[PDB]
Symmetry: C2
């Protein structure tokens, strides 16, 4: 009965086995979850049946023998989302694609086709920066980072221009006269910019939501500004509450400065809640998640910060050793953080290794989102009440039990408190998110 009760929007990041890099080891998922199509269908349906607004498929296009399991082998988003569309009915279908390594005409067509097949449920997560090295797969081994935002802005402008090629009513298909379309309702783009030259028109029409929804995750000054000028929904990962609140305020002001209505720029911080009936049960699940990293893996990553020091020689459950003499390869501030922690808390080597590891391996998991359904719901409500979120991007450490727990135990508590409507009516992704139908620039 809070005076500020409102529906909290949710999306779910389906990162194969889980947001935790070692989630493939957890028994609640199949080991090949990341490239197991039926697993994605099960998880998308689980989310859809709970009233989660969209499924989000993040992406990468670069591999090394050190890449995390999900980055070593994953589905490609247009193909995956198009297959999922046809086995679902309401849930949004949001896919990552890079501005630097895609032709805008192809992006426009592939996302427009997903949008039409799905009945207006497509979203495009516009990625401005890619993993370092990605350019090596596209004949551009040294990208000019300084231009990555200018490139992305123009690329997006081209895609959206192409999406307005065909007025909603252009395709007349008059069998009496033989007139298939009204020529004055088809538009050329004639884009000639610094980075792209694209004449158009596009060869596919607009969807029941007008155009696909634009997601972005810029965090730099330029990133936030691009989001304010061009995103419908903005996400993050790893933020504390105070950080998220600053981010929320900056994105909304950036929207207002661009002459847009900030009410229609949704902010969705990433979180990875872990719930149990008691704090003890939540904590046990969190320990399970922690132990997905073996002791050796925890130590190998500590070794990284101390010039490849071999920490395997020390007893795991003995005190963290006096390694103060050891240097670091430019991570001296991190090694200082590690040593301060070890000294201020009487930590063992195991506790230090996992502190470092577990924190970094689950960046959207903080202790405020670990506990009982009521406590975890209360924290989500707090983030929304206090202006850090309009909704959340769920990045669950393990996609199996993580999502099951969340949908079975958290959502019903939120619903009971007036902060989640599981049966929001709406054909389209825009409808779910409370965004207005996207009219053509030529309407």
């Amino acid at each position: 009965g809070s005076m500020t009760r409102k529906h909290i929007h949710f999306g779910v990041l389906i990162q194969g086995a889980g947001a935790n890099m070692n989630a493939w080891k957890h028994p609640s998922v199949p080991p090949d979850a990341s490239v197991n199509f039926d697993f994605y269908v099960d998880r998308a349906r689980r989310a859809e049946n709970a009233g989660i607004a969209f499924a989000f498929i993040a992406d990468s296009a670069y591999v090394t023998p050190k890449s995390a399991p999900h980055f070593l082998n994953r589905f490609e988003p247009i193909s995956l989302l198009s297959a999922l569309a046809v086995l679902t009915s309401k849930i949004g279908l949001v896919g990552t694609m890079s501005s630097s390594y895609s032709e805008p005409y192809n992006v426009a067509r592939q996302f427009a086709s997903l949008d039409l097949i799905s009945g207006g449920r497509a979203g495009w997560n516009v990625v401005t920066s890619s993993i370092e090295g990605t350019g090596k797969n596209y004949g551009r081994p040294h990208p000019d980072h300084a231009q990555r935002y200018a490139i992305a802005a123009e690329h997006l402008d081209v895609v959206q221009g192409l999406w307005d090629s065909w007025d909603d009513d252009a395709l007349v298909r008059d069998r009496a006269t033989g007139r298939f379309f009204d020529p004055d309702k088809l538009h050329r783009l004639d884009h000639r910019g610094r980075f792209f030259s694209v004449e158009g028109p596009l060869n596919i029409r607009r969807s029941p939501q007008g155009q696909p929804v634009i997601f972005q995750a810029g965090s730099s000054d330029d990133g936030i500004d691009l989001a304010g000028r061009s995103a419908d929904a903005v996400f993050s990962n790893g933020s504390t509450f105070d950080e998220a609140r600053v981010f929320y305020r900056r994105v909304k002001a950036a929207a207002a400065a661009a002459g847009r209505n900030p009410d229609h720029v949704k902010v969705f911080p990433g979180i990875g809640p872990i719930v149990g009936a008691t704090q003890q049960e939540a904590d046990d699940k969190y320990r399970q998640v922690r132990d997905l990293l073996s002791p050796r893996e925890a130590l190998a990553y500590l070794s990284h910060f101390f010039q490849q020091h071999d920490f395997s020689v020390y007893p795991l459950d003995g005190p963290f050793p006096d390694i103060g003499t050891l240097g670091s390869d430019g991570f001296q501030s991190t090694t200082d953080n590690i040593k301060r922690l070890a000294r201020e808390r009487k930590l063992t080597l195991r506790e230090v290794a996992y502190e470092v590891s577990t924190r970094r391996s689950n960046i959207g998991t903080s202790e405020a989102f670990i506990g009982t359904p009521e406590a975890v719901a209360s924290e989500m409500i707090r983030w929304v009440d206090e202006g850090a979120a309009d909704g959340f991007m769920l990045g669950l450490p393990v996609t199996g039990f993580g999502l099951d727990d969340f949908v079975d135990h958290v959502l019903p508590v939120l619903s009971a408190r007036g902060y989640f409507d599981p049966v929001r009516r709406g054909a389209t992704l825009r409808d779910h998110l409370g965004l207005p139908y996207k009219e053509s620039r030529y309407a």
Copy 2:
């Protein structure tokens, strides 16, 4: 005794540019997903080995109805995959206007989702003006074939990134993969530079099946060296046969088994119970284009001259030989296979509704009765359906 393979081109409403007017299809067929599902399943239930989605990426006010508005192939094929089970899934994508790493990922993903049913139709030249949508208003002219060859080499190299047994995912030890079973490409050529590895594994058929449609000397050479199946464009049996022999000769010269390069002429059969009924159906389809329209299109070629003051010229494979009774049309198809013009056929039906219904219900059963078509697709992969072996990795 000698199984004839079939693919079906699903060109929305039909191969006839005015197919949208025909009552056996919905007016919006070309962008009606449920209609593509219905047609794909109709073909699949009949034992047709693959659905083929052709493509374009340039539009003008004068473009044909299907070219004005169509689905994109990766998205369409991936949606069709999960509503079908056996049928092959073949999509056009251009070598000139796509990044090979993206092509590799998109087709490998389709391949994996579909259980090994993907095919890629590699198009070397696109429709004139396509380059204006990709910042290259006057593209490669001579070097389209060299770009296509290197692009394909990159994609196939990328598809062998992951040995079939590399992803051990051993929960007892925590070893996710064998690092010696993952390969970099490190391709540095004239047109492309791509390091690899790809971030997706190989499918149950190894790699997607490669289709090509080259007709020039360079086209034929490329197909003989690198195609698994080749689409042929003959309006006549003699043309088809000259083409077929050239492709098989190019395969031998490339050191390959010519029987593993399958040649599929495009045909559009029109059947009826009698020759008269078949001819009536032909006229009906032909009449979807008004003589006024046809003579107007003709006029644009010959200096805007008014030719109203010729019919066959104006309008102009369905041959005449593929217009007739089910038995006669089956006999002609059998003749093309037995006399060395075809290993199978790509069905480009004038209207995808009645055309496919007639073909599957009346012609295929005749071919089966004569020993030229096993309607049961027993294998799982597109390679299986086409009689091709599993594609082992270059590193196997």
